[PDB]
Design a protein around this motif. Sequence first.
Motif, PDB file in Angstrom:
ATOM      1  N   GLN A 261       0.825  -1.157  -0.104  1.00  0.00           N
ATOM      2  CA  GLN A 261       0.170   0.097   0.071  1.00  0.00           C
ATOM      3  C   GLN A 261       1.068   1.238   0.137  1.00  0.00           C
ATOM      4  O   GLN A 261       1.661   1.325   1.047  1.00  0.00           O
ATOM      5  N   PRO A 263       0.231   5.140  -0.429  1.00  0.00           N
ATOM      6  CA  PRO A 263      -0.392   6.526  -0.516  1.00  0.00           C
ATOM      7  C   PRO A 263       0.282   7.244  -1.526  1.00  0.00           C
ATOM      8  O   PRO A 263       1.470   7.073  -2.053  1.00  0.00           O
ATOM      9  N   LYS A 268       5.819   4.135  -4.674  1.00  0.00           N
ATOM     10  CA  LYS A 268       5.445   3.130  -5.340  1.00  0.00           C
ATOM     11  C   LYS A 268       6.444   2.783  -6.449  1.00  0.00           C
ATOM     12  O   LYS A 268       6.916   1.417  -6.601  1.00  0.00           O
ATOM     13  N   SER A 357      -5.750  -0.739  -7.055  1.00  0.00           N
ATOM     14  CA  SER A 357      -7.259  -0.387  -6.810  1.00  0.00           C
ATOM     15  C   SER A 357      -8.067  -0.434  -7.870  1.00  0.00           C
ATOM     16  O   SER A 357      -9.091  -0.876  -7.782  1.00  0.00           O
ATOM     17  N   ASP A 381      -3.297   1.649  -3.953  1.00  0.00           N
ATOM     18  CA  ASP A 381      -3.694   1.937  -2.711  1.00  0.00           C
ATOM     19  C   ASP A 381      -5.166   1.953  -2.555  1.00  0.00           C
ATOM     20  O   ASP A 381      -5.944   2.214  -3.400  1.00  0.00           O
ATOM     21  N   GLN A 384      -7.444   4.999  -3.026  1.00  0.00           N
ATOM     22  CA  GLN A 384      -7.581   5.581  -4.310  1.00  0.00           C
ATOM     23  C   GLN A 384      -8.689   4.815  -4.918  1.00  0.00           C
ATOM     24  O   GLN A 384      -9.566   4.088  -4.356  1.00  0.00           O
ATOM     25  N   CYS A 406      -7.189  -5.728  -2.679  1.00  0.00           N
ATOM     26  CA  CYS A 406      -7.608  -4.549  -1.656  1.00  0.00           C
ATOM     27  C   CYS A 406      -8.297  -5.237  -0.309  1.00  0.00           C
ATOM     28  O   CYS A 406      -7.957  -4.713   0.785  1.00  0.00           O
ATOM     29  N   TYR A 437      -6.151   7.093   5.907  1.00  0.00           N
ATOM     30  CA  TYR A 437      -4.699   6.528   6.129  1.00  0.00           C
ATOM     31  C   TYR A 437      -4.627   6.058   7.790  1.00  0.00           C
ATOM     32  O   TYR A 437      -3.482   5.702   8.218  1.00  0.00           O
TER      33      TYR A 437
END
Length: 572
Positions: A261, A263, A268, A357, A381, A384, A406, A437
């Motif tokens: 994950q 954010p 990423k 996502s 994420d 998102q 997810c 978060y």
Amino acid sequence: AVGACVLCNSQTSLRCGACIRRPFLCCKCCYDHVISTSHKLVLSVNPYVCNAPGCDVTDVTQLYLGGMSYYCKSHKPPISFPLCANGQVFGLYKVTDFNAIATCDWTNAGDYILANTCTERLKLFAAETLKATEETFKLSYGIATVREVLSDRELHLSWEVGKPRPPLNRNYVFTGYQIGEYTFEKDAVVYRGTTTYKLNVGDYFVLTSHTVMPLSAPTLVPQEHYVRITGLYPTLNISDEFSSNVANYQKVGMQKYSTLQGPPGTGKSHFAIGLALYYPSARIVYTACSHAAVDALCEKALKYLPIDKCSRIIPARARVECFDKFKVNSTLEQYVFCTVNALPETTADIVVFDEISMATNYDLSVVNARLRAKHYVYIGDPAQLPAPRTLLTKGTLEPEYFNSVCRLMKTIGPDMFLGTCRRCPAEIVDTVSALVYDNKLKAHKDKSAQCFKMFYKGVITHDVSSAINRPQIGVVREFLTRNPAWRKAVFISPYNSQNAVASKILGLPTQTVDSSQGSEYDYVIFTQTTETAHSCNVNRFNVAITRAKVGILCIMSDRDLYDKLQFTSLEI
Ligand SMILES: [Zn+2]
Ligand SMILES: [Zn+2]
Ligand SMILES: [Zn+2]
């Protein structure tokens, strides 16, 4: 006509002829389906219908085996067995959730919930059934025929009477008659062909309905935990840039699959490419649903990986322009960058699935089907935006039901969390940290003092269902005269029609929240436009304000999200 039961695997001759996917059901499971739903047609080598001439009894509960053939109550011979007896349907080799999946129309959130909380074989059945229903719904919309062509980016369309009119946005991609794929934007409409073709008057457009192939592979292979890094060989000489990720790269190598994950602006893409540099000999396939998500991984690779070991896989039916600096279609290069829909049949040491996502269970399955890999890494994420569910109109799909990855991330937590946002001023980081978060996202940057909120409901007009708020665009126009630095802002709103108006009055470049995801801009101007479920969705709101590197202005309609913004409030 002799396959395996989608519920308990038992071999059988029985499919359900009423299910649109015609799944193989065993004697026990086929009964529990037909007795509890409107589904009564049971196919075998022959269909379970009354063999008597002229007779139209197809309901298996009303049928009997008369010797070798099938007859209803009215036609059966004295020595006959009822097809439905002691919890079974007669066939060779002699479900609540399955019944809901098999019979639902996919208009309700609960449908998606059950397609993600059910067993693994029922997740594939659900995914197939959903996607087949989505495609057969495309057949229901009305044909658009060209009345007159104004310019190279405008024409007037004649719409089929009786059949509904589809939403005219980027989400709905049409096929011209094949003069290529075409999109539309709002009597003047903006036409965008994937081929620059002189759109002849009398040519027509239809939404391309594709055949739904069956699934075979699970969404998620069974988890394996290892005591040592398996089939992967780490560097010792590893660039200081990717020192932070090393412990997570050694987690990736000590499990079959892992979840990251990340954010917004937490690294990423950096994590994805840094995996190559930490396992320099490992063959890695980089995949995501969109061309934009795959291009972004390509751009980060171009900077860190040798260009002669990278290939960008492009399907021969080219839909939109994508990355051009790698060798194209060289399926065997150490680094392969490909959309899920275009993936070839291959193996890999690591598969990296990005923007998780946006993935459906259909996609998760197609990946596990086309790619056989020592390690699967899932990056995105759940805070998102998910793929649009065109049929879903009742209730909101929560992050834990986007797909199987997810769901793991929202229940047991992700394997790895990138905890430090490097893109956003602290006002934005602190807002989203608290919002989605659980206060675990940390800000690298200081507060910019260039993040502003104004509470201004304005007036909502509608281009069909797409919303416009001219006063909110008016407030922005007045802000721009006093705030020249913002002249370079990207305008963001949850609505295409709001953006079309913003583009004409402001001249700013324009983005829907959904199209902005994965992107960043120094300054963002956001007009919430409305107080609807769409415009108040916390994921969409999270993505909207984490596009900004320096400044954001948010003209809000919703008191709740307005009050949550840790921004300097403006007057007027
Ligand atoms: Zn069964
Ligand atoms: Zn059925
Ligand atoms: Zn009969």
